[PDB]
Structure formats: structure tokens, C-alpha cells
Design a protein around this nucleic acid. Sequence first.
DNA 1: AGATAAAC
DNA 2: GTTTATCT
Length: 60
Amino acid sequence: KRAGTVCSNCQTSTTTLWRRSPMGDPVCNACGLYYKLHQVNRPLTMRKDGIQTRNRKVSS
DNA sequence: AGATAAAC
DNA sequence: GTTTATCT
Ligand SMILES: [Zn+2]
């Protein structure tokens, strides 16, 4: 039940992987990934109503 | 969960 | 070049 777990980095409640930060900040995996890229705070301008999805990667 | 690779 | 979701 992650209803209420608002991503402390982008306020998104729908996430592909709830990255529970050790400090106690539930941040949607997307924030944890891009954060590792530039190591800065993500503006939720790229957020969306439901979890984004596409042609799932074919089983390799 | 974390890692991988894909797709735009 | 760049970013995230689904994969395992
Ligand atoms: Zn987030």
C-alpha cells in the first residue's frame, strides 16, 4: 500500500519502483536515477498522471 | 531492489 | 545524448 507515499523529490504517488531513501524520503526510482546522473534536485515538470510506459523491452 | 537496455 | 520503465 503506497497510497500516500508522495515522492519527496517530485510529489508523484505513482512510481515504477518506490526508492525508500535511508534518510526517510520515499522517492520514486526515476528521481533516484536522474539524481545519480547530475546529482541535483529534480523539478517534477516531467511528472505525469499515471506511471509512464512504452513497448516493454523484449525478453533478452 | 537493483540492474539492464531500450526508446525518444 | 539523454532519461525511465520494465526486466530479472
Ligand atoms: Zn520522484
